[model samples]
Target: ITSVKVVTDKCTYKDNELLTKYSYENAVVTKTASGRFDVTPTVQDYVFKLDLKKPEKLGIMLIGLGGNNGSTLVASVLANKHNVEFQTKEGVKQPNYFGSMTQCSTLKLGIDAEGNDVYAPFNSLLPMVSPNDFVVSGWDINNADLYEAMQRSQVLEYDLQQRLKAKMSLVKPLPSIYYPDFIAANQDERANNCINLDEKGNVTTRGKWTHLQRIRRDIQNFKEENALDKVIVLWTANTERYVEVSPGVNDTMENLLQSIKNDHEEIAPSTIFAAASILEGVPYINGSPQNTFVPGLVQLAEHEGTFIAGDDLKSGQTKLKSVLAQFLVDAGIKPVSIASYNHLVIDDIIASNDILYNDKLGKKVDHCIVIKYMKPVGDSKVAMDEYYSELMLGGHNRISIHNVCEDSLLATPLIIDLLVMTEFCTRVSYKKVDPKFENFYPVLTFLSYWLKAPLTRPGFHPVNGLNKQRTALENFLRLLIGLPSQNELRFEERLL
Candidate 1:
């Protein structure tokens, strides 16, 4: 058996004192240094000048984490990226893109394409959002393409995986973060292929960053080859547990970049992926529960005027809460003491235990506690909500209550919600509405309805709780056809 000494000898504390000092000092140095490493070749630097010309191009980057769950989510979004119209259940012609921020919704377009009018897809609403035009890539520890991932994770039925296998099989995740510190040490066997970084002092499991940079370089090359304009990156990986923030290190862009350069192990791999993406002035989002938008990362996004958001998808249990809250609010009732516990059943207990204990709980016990409680309790969800409100001040106070049917099945439509909202956010861009520049607010929020904990551009107040969230979505839907987002338009007057 290799001792910790032997294993970490490559990037660990063989010498406790020396390693500690080296780690600390190197981290300090990376904080202060700033320079660009441009791998571009100019005519002067080349014996033969290669003329670079511009062409129509867009690069779309996607990272799928957690096997088929991630792949399925991404595959669904990919299928919706294009402009496809079909007859709806109402026998009316309609355009659908499920839940992509770019595809399904409407946005304010900044320019006119070619001649007369251009009310393009929501994708066209952004400087970004080029449907089916951008290049896509990602990283995975298991080294499987989408098809294999679907089979291995066992999240999809054969019919679905088989049908989309060809299109999805083309997608291959690069390597990912498998740190014993952030995750489980028992995951070492799965950590076979990794992106290792040893600069001056610290060590970093390069993970997806290497793939991203490679893809970044590839985007530049492809742009040069095909004559294209811009690129954007997206991460639909599994949720990483939250990271502890350190002062002077993770609070500012300099500290954050320094942490990366010095190989600060305190930094989670997701943050590294995000930092790399935002540094290149690209838009970024966390499609998982993890805190990808750490303070430093957020500051970097702000400083560079890029976009970012996260916490978790408003999927699963959270979805139930959002809907229930909205229902109560509509009924003029306030919800309090709403505690939810879900016992979601699974086919594999040992496999889940191994994954949870080894990959999730073993490393971060705090995060593990959630998984521990969530252990295959069975295909049932038990949620309790207490609604209390006063109708006439001291005159009388009343309570209303109700329990829900099978919640596991109730969460089925979550993927659709995530897809549709994500599509909206992708195309939505923002600017500082005020001089202080404390926060950012997208003109429209699919967010209130999209995330469990919705993020607003700093200083901008967002609608909170359930009722407001649904109303936000309901109203936004109204905005599409130049009708009032709320109750202003009646059905008869708006008839076709």
Candidate 2:
């Protein structure tokens, strides 16, 4: 890989280190009268300190390692590392990271010597983790060779799978905890390889605590065994039933711990994994539409000052919805009704703070999400949506959208991007005015780009617009390098 050194007159250099200072300004808004508002410009100064030494060894652990998406991620990385090629009816195809942000995206680096715009690979801006260099280890309720799991998935082309099978055969999933009641009963057939279960078919108090210790131990061992500098844990497992959000149940860290000690039934398997990971100070992310981050979990993460982000991976349809909804609303279209349906047996519960459909006071609202299970659909999920909007006068406009996508294909690359971004964010620490800057707030709202239901601290607004999420991520990284925001004004070239 070719490394491009950045040159600028505004940066300071010292002992193989570079310190860049940036001042950011934003307009704070206020309400004055009915249908009127006032804006005040506010500014904050921050210093970004980036370590020149990049981590040599990094570990990535998945919660459902034996599943389709998990095995596919491993295979894809290995294939790219070896530059594996396979023959198809159309032609020969080579492995590449088309959907990964770090591997495939580009960023502008000001002007070139020829008075043209200079662009660089996104990964080149910082010393980020290479997918080929990751040390992978994870847990699964089903113990199987990753090779066999890939075949069972049937998501990839047969020819490509053949080339990757041998290497994947060497990787197997470790036994994981299982709570059969949380997942659909249809998934019970694959619950044979679970751990720490009693004869009565329940996880005893000892078993639950043991499970937590086992997870913590796994993280430590993976770091030591691989001689790694950092480790990140991601939950890619099946979506569990949403845990009821009630006081004294999962409202506080103390209550949650007490509940776990008393073997509470409300605690799901994913929550156990999250609690253990956060306590270990390893970053954790949820890639499923489940209640992994209950109130207690969020409170614990904030108190401990560990990084945690996610609730769901917004890949295919939901991503498009966020963008489309924003466009219609921003264009002065009044959308009165939206009907959406999917063939996947999962719920997309709208958040109370969802700005897409909720107001500032978080007015109570509802959405129609029909979850239909069709065995023949397999890994290909379909979404059908109809939107009704009010046009000029009393005219009505109706829009319909149908999308069919291979769920795993859309999710695999997103998992890769999430891993890279999450790991990189851990290395960045900043403060507004304090001499000693600290890591980002425990809740990583910056990663909202890749999540369906973005998790944020209480009283913080969750942004669901696709373009807004991308801009936030882009601008944050640009600030790290002392570059100006890409607002597309191009005032330097035009005005000058």
Candidate 3:
């Protein structure tokens, strides 16, 4: 039985069954006879069933397990699981998941008697896996143990590292596929643990399907060995260059499989991991900006009824940019242009001088992005955004923000959120005037909140507004537990 009481008829709890009705609300707009528009609000109600039997044991596989993000994730979990402490110039510091939405954030539950807002923990709304309990294993170009990887990461403090060495040293990334053409050049020194070797011990791309087979075997072995109830895979590796999409190569599921078998030159390592996860019937998340979900992989995921989400993890700079843009647009201010710059260990300074966007006032958005790599800064990221908008009565306003911190720490929590939320979505199935309960679409757009360029469904547009993303997340979560959507209209106080 659910510990919390179900206060509304929309929800019920009995014999491991949880059912709820939710009325999804939206509006339709059309141009009127003159220079005006008409809007009509509409609602469609549905019932959903959520299996309360959440997986007791969960596993996470990172394709770039030895990279900054991957190693940091393992280290953070081990450090926090034992509640290890560290020191600094100020005083003794405690370990915590400060940036995690599931562990460290809250949502407004409702209003109290005096119309005061009440809140609830984000994870409390549903069954979510605690980060500390996840069995983490993954692949890395470098075959070193996590302890060595963490030391090189320079993310956590020395004290935390010393405290967790015994366990971290035992954790090593399995050998992984390496497509030198897909990633940064001259990085072969780190390819010590490569699985692309043939029987002659020479690296070969002859049997591409062989590479996928080994990865599938790896997934099955990890799950069976660890006794995990479910497993999820994520790509936290270096971003791959955009590959050219061809008609016969990656157009359809069959074509894609044939290309892999034919050893097509364009097949990416991330695509292989995505296919392995899908064929195993597990969720796959791309934590980088590469189009890992090539159309063919998407079709396969849909065919296999697996969940896949990504394109990039919206951790640092992009996360803030989304919120700022929403603030300007929702406040009735017209954003004329937005300029974003950064100094980090990555390069994203591509310019679109030929391209312009439609600003709110029928003006073009002078949007620009610049990113540079600074080796000394290591994993520390320095980012700033300037929003130039049209203010009241033709006046202009500029809002500037500077952000700096450890990039992996910001990104690591997003990994947890993705895994926790991905696992939760697997247990939820819905029925809308249909007999059979069905899983959410394989694309998992709701997970767009955590990703930068969201991998949306076939025809739907991605929602980048941070507020709306959260609204979708929270309202869907509320629905899972038989609660009404959040309107924030305190009827108790407003009516009086």
Candidate 4:
């Protein structure tokens, strides 16, 4: 049963039903006369159903629960829940969820009596798993106490660490599966606690199926022990190298299962974990840059009716770069050259002209972007982007962006945002022309704002712009509740 009821004329509320009318755009493409393409946009109306039955309890299972990201997240949640505060060199600081979308972001709730904007918390759109309420448990190759891991992370201040140490010390990671070749060699030193190994250094598990079974069992035990209503698994481990995507290897579920049973070398740890979570009907999210969702895993999720999202969490540098690039491209400015890391450079004027130029005059533009690592930088990491473009009467214009942020601090909130949004998506279902209602595609591309590389269904282009991603998230939630979607066209005020 829903804990809260939203009274609105746009939404119909009744026993076990919340119905709303929604119109969605469908883009269609056709071949043109010159062997090119013609694009058309069409709008269709649909009824969106949001299940009002909220889960009694929610659990989050993380792949890496002891590393810098894992420990810091646990500690931050604990501090926030307890309202723990500590004395800082500047002053006394209290716990807050400043960067989290679920906690800090607001949604427009239409105008009030004074014709002013009235907004509410994003999570208020529906019943969501509160960070304070999530039951957290996970696996780690390094079996350090959460307290010790927090100290090792060097991210939290000393006073807060001491205050939260006792409570965090009680939480410890379970044994995890480790493939030495999948990660960097420097991480070997941290592989003290792993699963199913012998003195001969052989993984006694017969095949990938057994390895997957072990994870399933672990999740089952965790869920049962904690009395959780549902569990969502997220991979916060170190980035693994990309897996080769091939036809027979990972193209389909049957072929992939056969390959796993045959002990194929290309099967990485993230893939195995994803398989277990999906097979158990649990939603999974990848927070690293590895190819966890090969074609087969996506097929498995679709077949089993579960959700999966990720590639990498967009934290500091990459997110800023994406937003800047999106702005430049949208403003009719052509970036002919893009450079990164203060060394790597790329120039492709032809590509820029294809979009920014179609005729001979005003067809040429020059833009250069450079990213550099500043030496002797402090705790805050720095990001800078410079854009140069052709201006009026053959003149030139320059735009520069410099940003500074603590890397892990930026990441923790995004992790929470992903978890919250993924959890909420599980409750929504819609039907268009199809007769049957369907779950969202296993690939959740709407989460692109929080990810460096957003995962999308085949034939769909990934939208990386910051504002577009945020709009996607906001409007989707608005649709779920039968509210009119936001187009950001404030014509009412302008006309008045």
Candidate 5:
């Protein structure tokens, strides 16, 4: 990887250290009347202190290490790590990270001398950890080694699986906690390797605290055994049932701990894993559409000063919705209805924050989300969506789309993005007028680019537009390098 030689007075690179002081500008708006507003330009000065030294040893632990997405992630890294070349029906193909943005995409650094732009790899601009260098480990209820698990996944080609056998055969999943009530009923048969079982081999909720501590121990043991500098935990497990929000139980950190001590049946396996990682100061990412990031979990993370991101991996259909919805609304075409149909057995849920939609239409959007289970499809999703919008004088435009995607293949890249971005963000500490520098707020809203229901602090609205999310991420990277946020007003081309 080539280093971005930053040549400017805004930031200084003193060997393994970087300190950048920049003024962040924003337009604060106040509405005086309907369709009328006052905007105030505001600036906040901040000093960003980043340790240029990358981690000598970094690790990632997945909640479902034996599952399709989990195994595929590790397998992809192994393929890229060995630079495996194999023959297929088409031709000889070498492993590459096409889906991953950090590996495949480049960013515009600035304009060059001859009216061109200087570009650098997205990963190069920031000292992000390569997914290939990650030491992968984690827990799974069905404890199959990755080689066997990869075959069971059936997501990869036979040739690639054959090449990965030796390396993945020994990579086993640690036994994980299981709450049968949380997942589909048919999944109980695969509960062979579980921490929530007894001599009778029956799953129990009696030892919730024990389960929490065991997960904590798992994180500690992996870090010690691997001799790693940092290890981030991610949940790529089954989409579990959402827990009901009970007052005084999951509303605060103190009550949440008390509930866990009381072996609260409402506490989920995801919750246990989250609390464990937060207490350990290891970052955690949730890649499922579940209520894992409860209000109390946010409290626990904020109290511990540990970074956390979650709600769902916005990979295929919902990802496009975030983009299309923004595009339609921004172009003066009012989107009145959004209908999507997929294959899954999920309960009633809306992934995107409707406040964003309501703000655009000045009313609730008609959103229809449906998922049906089809067994044979397996690890592949067929998403059908129709975006019906209002044109002019009661005129309507109907837009339909059909998207077929391999689930794990699409998700693998997002998993990598979340890991690299979350890890890099933790390394950045900032200070305003204060003397001491501090880390970002516990909830990582900037990661909304990859998350479906982006988790934020209480009473805060989330930005669901994919374009806006990407711009936020891009501008933040620019800010870290001692540059102002990206501005596309090209005076060289337009002004003169």
Candidate 6:
């Protein structure tokens, strides 16, 4: 695992699948007279070049939906996988979205005067789009075909769903665990279509560990069947009630695993599946907020050499928080408090839209006070953020902005970003830096900025804690390959 070489079709070779170069016999290159093994470390070249490899397979487990948003997202990915451009309400615009970190990804083009081009695909440095080798699948408790679910949910307008309904109808979710103890009771109505208890009510006991085991097993089976080199499981389903650390129970991984066997009443089904995913060597990402990774799962995954990390997947408002927080920091000001009073239009948002991400934000602030105002429309989203700040000697200033856009419309582009980013992340693993060297091994560190809460190895700490965008930008310069901006732009200016 220390080093890997990737050979792909775009690298002056005709092979489709990425292959490795092995030196069956030593050969002499132009610089050497003695036989040397031909080794290929991950390398990328521009314009008909031979270099490294791209990630192998990307798998996403689409959980929620039973809505228009889910239907449209799944459909777009399917079309992209088949090498077709996806159509939108606006008609077929050349299917390129600029928001996603993974799709409109980038690579260092040897450094230009402006900086790395954000528009380039990370894979473009090496090969063509992984050639639609990607696969789309998931588990939904409702078991509705994507098309039927879309129609029933009525999330999208007619034309888009109509165009996509045929393909959407074919992909369906597998039976997933549905427990009264895990999700909000209001969602129980959807349970009629989900896989329910056996003749023995004990089999579907609320808050039972055995139920979670079934979820873990499902993930394992999928990995084994696909012979997938790597897998990332994201819980985009309904958000569950918040949980905290409890002793003699979820205090540690050992305790949590033991509690499962003991049928501990407190462990949520999400924790079980997450623990199971880590144990099975698959990355489990909780798209919802839950105590899925307190001390218990974190300690266990570390010990097992497996990985697990996720809290909430920021889809709407929080995405803007990241942007604004960075903006204030970049402006050379300390934000004492940031807050928002946001509202969403009921019909405009999906059935699951009113969940936990916003409900919990107010409790975490210690600053000068920032507020966001949201007004809802069925297909459209309007948000306004007000920043309250302290200037010199108790002097204060407040800034306000009104951000309005379609919720589902905004999310549609975001879905594409999440998928491609997850795919690329699954392909990257770090080689530990040798103490003798001061630099990171091969510098794949640019991936750091994409994650909301990035995962770090044992010896490494992620840089997301910074209060400003400049911090991320500066850190990216240091960790990723780059020189800082001089802020003076002259077309032919050369460095001293």
What's the lDDT for residue 295 in model 3?
86
- The TM-score of candidate 6 is 0.68
By lDDT, who's the top model here? 5
- lDDT measured at residue 157 in model 6 versus the true structure, 0 to 100: 57
Looking at model 2, residue 330 earns an lDDT score of: 70
Give the top-scoring candidate (TM-score). Answer: 3
- Predictions in order: lDDT: 0.47, 0.78, 0.82, 0.77, 0.83, 0.52
Order candidates by lDDT, high to low: 5, 3, 2, 4, 6, 1
Per-residue lDDT of model 1, residues 246-317, tens digit only = 787778888877777666766776676677666665555565676667678888876776666544556445
The residue pairs in collision within model 5 are none
Clashing pairs in 2: none
For TM-score, candidate 4 versus 5, the one ahead is 5
C-alpha RMSD values across all candidates: 19.7, 4.2, 3.9, 3.9, 3.6, 12.6
Worst 10 residues of 5 by lDDT: 344-353
lDDT, candidate 5, 357-381, per-residue tens = 4545455557787889887986788
Candidate 3, superposed: residue stretches over 4 Å from native? 1-3, 345-362
Task: Encode model 3's per-residue lDDT on 381-450: one tens digit a residue.
Answer: 9988888888778799988889999998988988888899998888777877432778877877788789
TM-score of 3: 0.93
Candidate 2: tens digits of C-alpha lDDT, residues 275-352: 888888888999998878999999888887788977898876878866676677677665666778989501121331
Q: Write the per-residue lDDT of candidate 4 for residues 1-496, one digit (tens) a residue.
A: 3232446566776677666767777789997789788889988877767777767667988899987778878988899989999889999998987888889888886777766787888888777878887778899989999999988777788999999989999999988887767887577678877775755765443456677778999999998988886889999997898888899889999888787777687788888889889988889999998988999988888898999986888865666666666666667666544444432101223333455655654454444445455545433566556767655567676776667666667788889888888887787777774338777677776788888778877676676567777988888887777666675677677766
